[PDB]
Ligand binder design. Structure first.
Ligand SMILES: CC(C)=CCC/C(C)=C/CC/C(C)=C/CSP(=O)(O)OP(=O)(O)O
Ligand SMILES: CC(C)=CCC/C(C)=C/CC/C(C)=C/CSP(=O)(O)OP(=O)(O)O
Ligand SMILES: CC(C)=CCC/C(C)=C/CC/C(C)=C/CSP(=O)(O)OP(=O)(O)O
Ligand SMILES: CC(C)=CCC/C(C)=C/CC/C(C)=C/CSP(=O)(O)OP(=O)(O)O
Ligand SMILES: CC(C)=CCC/C(C)=C/CNCCN[C@H]1[C@@H]2C[C@H]3C[C@@H](C2)C[C@@H]1C3
Ligand SMILES: CC(C)=CCC/C(C)=C/CNCCN[C@H]1[C@@H]2C[C@H]3C[C@@H](C2)C[C@@H]1C3
Ligand SMILES: CC(C)=CCC/C(C)=C/CNCCN[C@H]1[C@@H]2C[C@H]3C[C@@H](C2)C[C@@H]1C3
Ligand SMILES: CC(C)=CCC/C(C)=C/CNCCN[C@H]1[C@@H]2C[C@H]3C[C@@H](C2)C[C@@H]1C3
Lengths: 341, 341, 341, 341
């Protein structure tokens, strides 16, 4: 039992806000989602640990799920901060895992493995094309959508038809990952070594070297690339909407909707905004407090999404290059919203 | 005795051209500049590789010179071709190094570390201004000039007073390095990632983007910039002439003069020549043979420099922006040349 | 209006010729232009009083335009002769200013402000390059060009299309300023302290000390420097031609053409004329009367510019270093002239 | 630790006052400023030895910065007092320097070289004009200002933006050097040879021979000229307060402010005072102890600067030749100050 409490404490420490979002769910769903989070979290620590050998990761990850049974396993010497602990004391995790609906355990193990291997793939090669981009996001966040959607069905709160086609569930994942990948460009490019996520295929058209955007001598082509990333992210909106509109349970909806609304808001703030290149553009807490408050039912979350996407549209002028394209994707989004209002 | 032979063989394989000039010098000093060449070439290769962490270099380069005193040291996998062969078999260099005059050993070591540290500085940032440009060239070539002038004095072949002021020697290095950077513009910008050296302080007056010079459309702006670049290099000629006129030894002179003449000849051909932007402009093998044959004594090499400098001026029109600047810089080169006849 | 009269009376006292040329304008615009002239002349008086400290100029210039809406304002310890009277009685100008259309007041105020700032910048540093030369001329002359153009549009006499690209207008002030700087060399360098406007970037090719041009010893290079300066002013002729041809109003035309024709006449006179280095070269009163008489319509003024341009060219021969440079520029101007015949 | 201790020991022996001020700095920064000071002091010792032939200085000074990489270099026949011990045991400085940190080494290296070249400019000529005076001040003090600012930034204690425009850093240095050159007029001129810093452009308006000011005979003009020198010095105050107002770190602030406040108090005391000509005017120990204690934050140091400027102002009568000009300079200073209160 003190295992469950450990998982929730490490979570509160590892992901501040998500530790609030997860509280929307009922303990049963809550327990699985928390386990699921930590499992993927540990897995993410290994992949990101720059201080250790690659061949080591390739020989580990592929069987990281296997450990979900060995209540004595753990990794002391990996990652930093809380993560390191999560691994060294990874026993409580599996100890909690052990006592979850059989079905839940299968989604976790399943998704974990799939993501692990997926991570390996991109651990060798690099992301240069948009196809690389989307596929990486699939392994990194899309699969979380698959897993969470499979958990929703399993639990019984949502209709099994929801898990039939996971295309939109994938879109939910990607939309969150891309919005975050865009917002954290600077924070990540400053890392040691520098972490880059923007696809070569997109920025190549705006510069010869990514690190160039740090110097505003290149703002022009910096923002212009930013707008192109924001545009590539908007593609998903229409699908996030459908997915949300298909949800029926009040718990699963709020849990699924809040993060999406948070991303749209963030996206409408980093769009056509050079501050992204020298700092972390963030939403105000009032704004997130309001988002967390009204994102409990379809109609209300639709008006918020609309409001944010419209504000993003206001960010530009006819002058701006990306205009015709953004206007397009935006109207494709509002249309999607209107058909559910 | 097998060690030295290895050096001259790899030297021959790498910089085939220089491999002939060095053969000009007497065996004792010849070994010096040979090992000197290789050390800096080894260093340059390390710094070169595009598949190595910046952080690695920024740490390993500044300590490179320390390996010269470790006959066991070598590097495993970096830099294709014969370069690979140097860093792996670097062993034979250190050996040879060990048996050279202490003074020689010190010159090589001093220049090396100063160069490595200069390269490090430019690993993090780019060449944006003329100062940046003159400083970058100083690190990768001007110092080579500093080093060669010290070996000359150390050797007794030249009068100690030669190393009193190393400003002109620095000019010698800069003159070669710039002619090269100018001449290899296309070959360098077509690299991955692109290699850019022309300073923004200069080209920003002719374009907003350097890659624009690859298209015929911008051919007019490309050339004007090329000429501004050629003007910047001519700044050094008077000093080169000064330096050559100060050498008293035939062997050292021929070795110092030949590369300089080759450079002016190349400069007179790339200047105001649009081919620079799609091919590698070079003098005819007959011309270099002619230069190698006669650049053995001051008067002869001065009238060859004069000749090329005059051929250069005859390529521009009274309607080319660079008219005044070039005509001035040219008339200035010739005066310094006439000042020694 | 005791004010509008003081203006014209000081105008005449300060500048005889302009006082005759301004009469080509119709009253409304004439008052505007007269005021405009005095405001800028006041700025000139300050920037030029070498007896007062720079701290004063950098303090007063930037906020000079503010005084325009402050009748009762004046300055009592700056300038000589009438200029000094202008400032100590500036109230007569601001009053008159006040009674002008807002459209006029605004242009005068705008240009005044930007010229002050230009003057403040070149008070902190000196003109070394051609770019500095062109920019300084832009601040003290070209800007006046812009101002007159806006006034012509604001009055309705000229079509608004005139203010689309103020580039040719800038060329207009630049041609007069340069021909003038060229002609006043001796007078300028003889003042206490010496005044210098020829840019180092141009004369550094002929001398190390511009004062050397006063001695016959250096006559040969002085003439070459003068001719290079002329070559530099001839660049603007084609544009002055374009600008003149775009004018539809007879008054604006006469007012704008006469000074340009006077300048060309003068330029043709100082060209390749060693006398520039010891005296003030001028056109005969007969020729300036002929010029004032015919510069009323495009064709006539077009043939006069041609005639002076041909005279200019005729004053040179093969041996002259500048021959090619000059012959090129001449044909370019002739062409633009015939290009409208 | 031994090398570093020798540096602080010689610093205290050689520059008593600065030895105290530097203790306002913390750790890495204090070491770097210490080495910086000694390096410029060693340089200054060589440039000032009159037994050293010019040709040597002209050749050795531009290379001085190069000795920083030579941990065996030193000099033995130059310097007075422990200045000799410094050059004799320079290996301590060079050695301590090698352990500073790339960023610090380059600042020190660059400024040293730039100062060295500037000194050479003035070993061949003398200060005649106001511009010469400023350039000279820039070379010996202004550059220190540039150097200190870079070191602040490189330490991270101040915002990187601080170094975008080093103009005010220059004024900071110039205010100190000028106040100093004024206060020490007599001591300077009373040497063999006599030390003269006051620029001809200023004093020739008051006398034909500068020594004339030692006689209470020419006294009247000595003070009128003294006042002119102070006026020229007050020019920098508004810029000095701008600089101080832009600092965020307490240590860096105290270190930067104390000397400026000392200069203003001294300046307000030497102003319009005949004693400057036969005695070294100083502030009371109590006054200087008060400045050291309160110059810890902006508001308090501004209050003190205000006090000393007004005290300076109130030492002249309306009948003084410098009245109006000093009054304006004073007002410029005070407005500036209020601008930050
Ligand atoms: C339901 C469905 C189909 C898909 C769900 C999509 C995914 C991948 C959801 C995970 C949500 C999380 C962990 C959000 C963190 S709050 P934040 O974004 O503000 O950043 P933080 O992790 O707290 O640092
Ligand atoms: C004597 C003195 C003061 C300075 C000497 C200046 C310098 C830096 C000389 C190095 C000369 C070299 C290596 C020329 C290569 S021939 P290449 O240019 O055609 O190209 P390659 O290296 O053969 O591929
Ligand atoms: C129309 C346009 C776009 C631009 C006009 C360009 C400028 C700056 C014109 C001002 C003309 C003046 C004041 C000429 C003086 S006659 P003068 O040269 O004989 O000498 P003076 O000033 O009378 O002593
Ligand atoms: C921070 C900044 C932008 C500029 C700083 C300006 C400069 C050049 C400062 C040097 C400060 C020194 C050495 C003061 C000593 S007091 P003293 O002259 O009374 O006694 P001393 O003989 O020099 O020990
Ligand atoms: C919510 C459950 C069950 C799992 C979280 C998914 C998990 C930790 C994935 C590991 N991969 C790192 C990429 N992290 C991304 C996800 C989490 C944050 C918000 C979104 C989605 C963008 C990124 C930061
Ligand atoms: C002649 C001895 C002793 C050394 C050569 C100096 C060395 C290998 C410098 C490494 N820096 C890379 C830039 N290389 C430049 C140098 C060699 C080629 C001709 C010149 C000078 C222009 C460039 C191509
Ligand atoms: C005609 C109106 C509106 C203003 C006059 C322009 C004015 C006096 C500018 C102040 N800046 C000094 C540069 N003065 C130059 C201009 C006037 C004279 C002939 C030309 C152009 C060369 C110089 C002497
Ligand atoms: C503050 C650091 C790091 C160094 C001091 C800079 C240094 C020794 C300059 C040598 N150049 C002679 C000009 N010396 C002047 C400076 C030092 C004293 C106070 C001010 C400023 C007036 C003069 C006496």
């Amino acid at each position: 039992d003190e295992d469950l409490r450990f998982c929730y404490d490490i979570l509160q420490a590892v992901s501040r806000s998500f530790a609030v979002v997860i509280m929307e769910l009922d303990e049963e769903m809550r327990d699985a989602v928390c386990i699921f989070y930590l499992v993927l979290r540990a897995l993410d620590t290994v992949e990101d640990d720059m201080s250790i050998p690659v061949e080591f990761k390739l020989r580990e990850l592929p069987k990281f799920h296997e450990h979900l049974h060995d209540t004595t396993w753990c990794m002391s010497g990996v990652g930093v901060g809380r993560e390191r602990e999560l691994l060294e004391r990874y026993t409580h995790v599996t100890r909690a895992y052990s006592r979850l609906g059989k079905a839940y355990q299968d989604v976790i193990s399943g998704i974990c493995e799939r993501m692990a291997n997926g991570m390996c793939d991109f651990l060798t090669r690099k992301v240069e094309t948009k196809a690389d981009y989307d596929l990486y996001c699939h392994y990194v966040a899309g699969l979380v959508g698959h897993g969470l959607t499979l958990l929703y069905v399993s639990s019984g709160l949502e209709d099994v038809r929801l898990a039939d086609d996971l295309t939109n569930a994938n879109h939910m994942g990607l939309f969150l990952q891309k919005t975050n990948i865009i917002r954290d460009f600077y924070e990540d490019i400053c890392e040691v070594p520098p972490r880059v996520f923007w696809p070569r295929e997109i920025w190549e058209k705006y510069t010869d070297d990514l690190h160039a955007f740090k110097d505003e001598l290149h703002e022009a082509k910096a923002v212009e690339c930013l707008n192109a990333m924001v545009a590539d992210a908007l593609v998903h909106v229409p699908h996030v909407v459908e997915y949300l509109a298909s949800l029926r349970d009040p718990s699963v909806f709020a849990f699924s909707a809040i993060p999406q609304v948070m991303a749209m808001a963030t996206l409408s703030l980093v769009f056509n905004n050079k501050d992204v290149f020298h700092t972390k553009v963030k939403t105000t807490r009032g704004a997130t407090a309001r988002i967390f408050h009204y994102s409990t039912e379809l109609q209300a979350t639709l008006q918020m999404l609309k409001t944010y996407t419209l504000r993003l549209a206001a960010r530009m002028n006819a002058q701006d290059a990306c205009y015709d394209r953004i206007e397009h994707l935006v109207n494709d989004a509002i249309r999607a919203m209107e058909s559910h209002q």
